[PDB]
């Protein structure tokens, strides 16, 4: 394995939501085999950020999901060489964006090149007016579109007032090296966490848990 049971993980974000720039880095640790991460982020370029942080949390690694010995790990098989995604994220409201991650691994350390970009965002809307509470637990639906391994999540951000903002993402993964065997079809359960913010979110602490499973209890 060249997967640790403690990985460091450091991350840049650059991104543009609705105009507005701005540039994120993150500082963290992981256990890679119990599919648990969390990271120190702070905002370097733009803050006070003019939009809901909520919307950039899922950009901030597949790598960190307890994988059972009956599905193939595609992740932990990407390394020493890496991966990257790209994912499409759709909110109810017409909001739209796309983002990537190219993760590489230097001796005990994920490094991770993020870019995020979102428009059409309402100024009238949740994001725009910071009225979000935390993504719902998920359920991430693993399969294989023309040769490529696809994750599609169907999910909402909780907003003040007991109301759903909903969120379709897709995501498609890539490994580096030609010959990582794609997996069967599959199931990731995530439950993503602010375990603490300063006032304008300019410092924020991460939290991660990820399992992967057949849908079987």
């Known amino acids: 394995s060249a997967i640790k049971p403690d990985m460091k993980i450091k991350l840049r974000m650059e991104g543009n939501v609705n105009?507005?720039?701005?540039?994120?880095?993150?500082?963290?640790?992981?256990k890679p085999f119990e599919g648990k991460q969390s990271m120190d982020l702070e905002v370097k370029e733009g803050g006070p950020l003019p939009f809901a942080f909520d919307i950039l949390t899922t950009a901030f690694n597949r790598v960190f999901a307890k994988y059972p010995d009956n599905i193939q790990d595609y992740f932990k098989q990407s390394f020493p060489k890496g991966y990257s995604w790209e994912r499409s994220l759709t909110f109810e409201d017409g909001g739209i964006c796309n983002a990537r991650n190219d993760i590489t691994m230097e001796g005990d350390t994920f490094y991770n090149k993020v870019r995020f970009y979102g428009t059409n965002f309402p100024a009238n809307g949740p994001v725009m007016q910071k009225k979000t509470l935390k993504w719902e637990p998920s359920?991430?639906?693993?399969?294989?579109?023309?040769?490529?391994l696809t994750g599609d999540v169907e999910t909402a951000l909780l907003l003040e007032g007991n109301a759903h903002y909903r969120c379709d993402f897709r995501t498609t993964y890539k490994a580096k090296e030609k010959g990582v065997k794609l997996p069967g079809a599959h199931f990731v359960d995530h439950?993503?966490?602010?375990?603490?913010?300063?006032?304008?979110?300019?410092?924020?602490?991460?939290?991660?848990?990820?399992?992967?499973?057949?849908?079987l209890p």
Do not use: P, Q, W
């Open 191 to 215: 439950c993503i966490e602010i375990l603490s913010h300063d006032k304008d979110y300019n410092k924020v602490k991460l939290y991660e848990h990820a399992v992967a499973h057949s849908g």
């Open 19 to 30: 105009g507005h720039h701005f540039v994120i880095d993150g500082d963290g640790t992981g």
């Open 139 to 148: 359920t991430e639906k693993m399969y294989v579109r023309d040769g490529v």
